[PDB]
Structure formats: structure tokens, C-alpha cells
Design an enzyme around this catalytic site. Structure first.
Site, PDB file in Angstrom:
ATOM      1  N   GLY A  45      36.498   9.545  21.125  1.00  0.00           N
ATOM      2  CA  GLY A  45      37.489   9.709  22.032  1.00  0.00           C
ATOM      3  C   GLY A  45      38.802   8.808  21.365  1.00  0.00           C
ATOM      4  O   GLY A  45      38.815   7.809  21.156  1.00  0.00           O
ATOM      5  N   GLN A  50      46.885   5.683  22.748  1.00  0.00           N
ATOM      6  CA  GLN A  50      46.409   4.732  21.874  1.00  0.00           C
ATOM      7  C   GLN A  50      47.086   4.501  20.543  1.00  0.00           C
ATOM      8  O   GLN A  50      46.995   3.786  19.638  1.00  0.00           O
ATOM      9  CB  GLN A  50      45.093   4.949  21.809  1.00  0.00           C
ATOM     10  CG  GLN A  50      43.945   4.532  23.018  1.00  0.00           C
ATOM     11  CD  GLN A  50      42.768   4.718  22.650  1.00  0.00           C
ATOM     12  OE1 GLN A  50      42.255   5.888  23.124  1.00  0.00           O
ATOM     13  NE2 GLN A  50      41.974   3.844  22.097  1.00  0.00           N
ATOM     14  N   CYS A  91      35.791   1.177  22.543  1.00  0.00           N
ATOM     15  CA  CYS A  91      37.326   1.537  22.639  1.00  0.00           C
ATOM     16  C   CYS A  91      38.004   1.362  21.155  1.00  0.00           C
ATOM     17  O   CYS A  91      37.790   0.075  20.964  1.00  0.00           O
ATOM     18  CB  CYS A  91      38.175   0.910  23.662  1.00  0.00           C
ATOM     19  SG  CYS A  91      39.728   2.013  23.837  1.00  0.00           S
ATOM     20  N   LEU A  92      38.459   2.132  20.609  1.00  0.00           N
ATOM     21  CA  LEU A  92      39.195   1.900  19.307  1.00  0.00           C
ATOM     22  C   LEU A  92      40.520   0.923  19.582  1.00  0.00           C
ATOM     23  O   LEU A  92      40.981   0.370  18.597  1.00  0.00           O
ATOM     24  CB  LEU A  92      39.480   3.249  18.795  1.00  0.00           C
ATOM     25  CG  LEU A  92      38.519   4.320  18.201  1.00  0.00           C
ATOM     26  CD1 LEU A  92      39.055   5.354  17.650  1.00  0.00           C
ATOM     27  CD2 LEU A  92      37.685   3.491  17.049  1.00  0.00           C
ATOM     28  N   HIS A 133      36.876   7.651  30.645  1.00  0.00           N
ATOM     29  CA  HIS A 133      37.427   6.181  29.940  1.00  0.00           C
ATOM     30  C   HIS A 133      38.732   6.888  29.477  1.00  0.00           C
ATOM     31  O   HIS A 133      39.813   6.123  29.387  1.00  0.00           O
ATOM     32  CB  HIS A 133      36.481   6.081  28.664  1.00  0.00           C
ATOM     33  CG  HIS A 133      36.982   5.301  27.892  1.00  0.00           C
ATOM     34  ND1 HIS A 133      36.409   3.769  27.497  1.00  0.00           N
ATOM     35  CD2 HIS A 133      37.953   5.025  26.846  1.00  0.00           C
ATOM     36  CE1 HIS A 133      37.156   3.271  26.520  1.00  0.00           C
ATOM     37  NE2 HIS A 133      37.949   4.227  26.068  1.00  0.00           N
ATOM     38  N   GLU A 134      39.002   8.158  28.832  1.00  0.00           N
ATOM     39  CA  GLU A 134      40.128   8.514  28.376  1.00  0.00           C
ATOM     40  C   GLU A 134      41.194   8.902  29.225  1.00  0.00           C
ATOM     41  O   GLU A 134      42.420   8.543  28.905  1.00  0.00           O
ATOM     42  CB  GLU A 134      39.923   9.812  27.396  1.00  0.00           C
ATOM     43  CG  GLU A 134      39.144   9.533  26.141  1.00  0.00           C
ATOM     44  CD  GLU A 134      39.504   8.261  25.353  1.00  0.00           C
ATOM     45  OE1 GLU A 134      40.748   8.162  25.043  1.00  0.00           O
ATOM     46  OE2 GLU A 134      38.670   7.635  24.798  1.00  0.00           O
ATOM     47  N   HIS A 137      43.099   5.596  30.205  1.00  0.00           N
ATOM     48  CA  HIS A 137      44.209   5.502  29.080  1.00  0.00           C
ATOM     49  C   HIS A 137      45.584   5.977  29.434  1.00  0.00           C
ATOM     50  O   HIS A 137      46.613   5.162  29.404  1.00  0.00           O
ATOM     51  CB  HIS A 137      43.759   5.865  27.741  1.00  0.00           C
ATOM     52  CG  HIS A 137      43.214   5.086  26.900  1.00  0.00           C
ATOM     53  ND1 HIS A 137      43.299   3.870  26.609  1.00  0.00           N
ATOM     54  CD2 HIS A 137      41.754   5.038  26.145  1.00  0.00           C
ATOM     55  CE1 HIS A 137      42.439   2.970  26.044  1.00  0.00           C
ATOM     56  NE2 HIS A 137      41.494   3.970  25.727  1.00  0.00           N
TER      57      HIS A 137
HETATM   58 ZN   LIG Z   1      39.530   3.893  24.742  1.00  0.00          ZN
END
Ligand SMILES: [Zn+2]
Length: 172
Positions: A45, A50, A91-92, A133-134, A137
Site C-alpha cells: 500500500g 507518502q 508502513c513504508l 490505513h491508506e 494517510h
Molecule cells: Zn502507511
């Protein structure tokens, strides 16, 4: 070659993203660079927040084979139950940190695709975890915000160390 991913506690991760006005070929190219970046990491994701593009665009591929890509533009997510499910999330943008979060187990997703078509699906399991989650963001929220302050603090100290090792790895 790949797009840089912002790291916690970078303040730009707290930006609330703007709707996508039209799915132009520059938003198409951005989605394709997001996929490469995501797949390289590797991740499942990535939200456009991000990569410091403050737009409602999410790329995702939940498959073992890196072969089931999905795009969500301007998404609306509504829970379909009070039942939650724990999931250990990463999470990246919080690299190499994982912890437990509890989110509604089933949700409805309305978004548009890379052609400008609307769609509406219902999601449970990994899809429901990942889309929520996304979506977070795009409202300037990170999964570490649901943890205790000491766990958040530890996460922050560890991530600066990993980012510093990553830079040092570029000089070697
Ligand atoms: Zn994330």
C-alpha cells in the site's frame, strides 16, 4: 530512479490531501511511479501523501505475486460494523516498525479508477485493514497515532536510526 518516500516524523505526512480534479495522464504517470516505488520497497500500500504529493490517490497490491494492482482515487470508506479485527500493521513511512491496530472489520469502498469510472465494493480481511490505513494517510494520520506515546516515541527514535543507516548506505 524511484520516488522518495517520506519518513516519520516528517511534518509533511500530516498534510490533508486534496481531491483529484481529473484523472489526467500526469496522475496516471504518478500512479505508475507510486507502484514502482511500492513494489521496490517492498510494500502492499502507498498513499500519494507518502511521496509528498498531497492528492487523494492510493495504490495497492495485496497479492503474493505482485500482479494484482488496484487504484483508489478520491475514496470514501464507510464501516459496515462495529466489530473490529486486530492486525499487525506496517508502513513504508514508518520503516521497519510493526504493531497491532484494531479497525472496523468490514467496510464499503467508493472510489474512482485510472479511467475516471466510479466503483463501489465491500471489503473485509486485509483489504479493509489496508484501505483504512491508506485513507488515514490522506487525512494526515499515521498508524503510530493509535499507539501509546512511549511506543510512538521509540518508533520515532528507531526510524531516525534506519533513515541515517539508509543514507550511509548510499555513500558506501
Ligand atoms: Zn502507511
Amino acid at each position: 530512479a524511484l520516488l522518495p518516500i517520506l519518513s516519520f516524523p516528517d511534518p509533511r505526512l500530516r498534510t490533508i490531501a486534496k481531491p483529484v480534479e481529473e484523472v489526467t495522464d500526469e496522475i496516471r504517470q504518478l500512479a505508475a511511479d507510486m507502484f514502482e516505488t511500492m513494489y521496490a520497497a517492498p510494500g502492499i500500500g502507498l498513499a500519494a501523501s507518502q511521496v509528498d504529493r498531497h492528492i487523494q490517490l492510493i495504490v495497492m497490491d495485496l497479492s503474493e505475486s505482485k500482479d494484482e494492482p488496484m487504484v483508489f482515487i478520491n475514496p470514501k470508506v464507510t464501516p459496515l460494523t462495529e466489530e473490529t479485527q486486530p492486525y499487525e500493521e506496517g508502513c513504508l513511512s514508518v520503516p521497519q516498525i510493526y504493531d497491532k491496530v484494531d479497525r472496523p472489520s468490514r467496510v464499503k469502498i467508493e472510489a474512482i479508477n485510472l479511467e475516471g469510472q466510479a466503483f463501489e465494493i465491500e471489503a473485509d480481511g486485509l483489504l479493509a485493514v489496508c484501505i483504512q490505513h491508506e485513507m488515514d494517510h490522506l487525512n494526515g494520520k499515521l498508524f503510530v497515532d493509535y499507539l501509546s506515546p512511549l511506543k510512538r516515541q521509540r518508533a520515532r527514535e528507531k526510524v531516525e536510526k534506519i533513515v541515517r543507516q539508509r543514507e550511509r548506505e548510499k555513500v558506501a
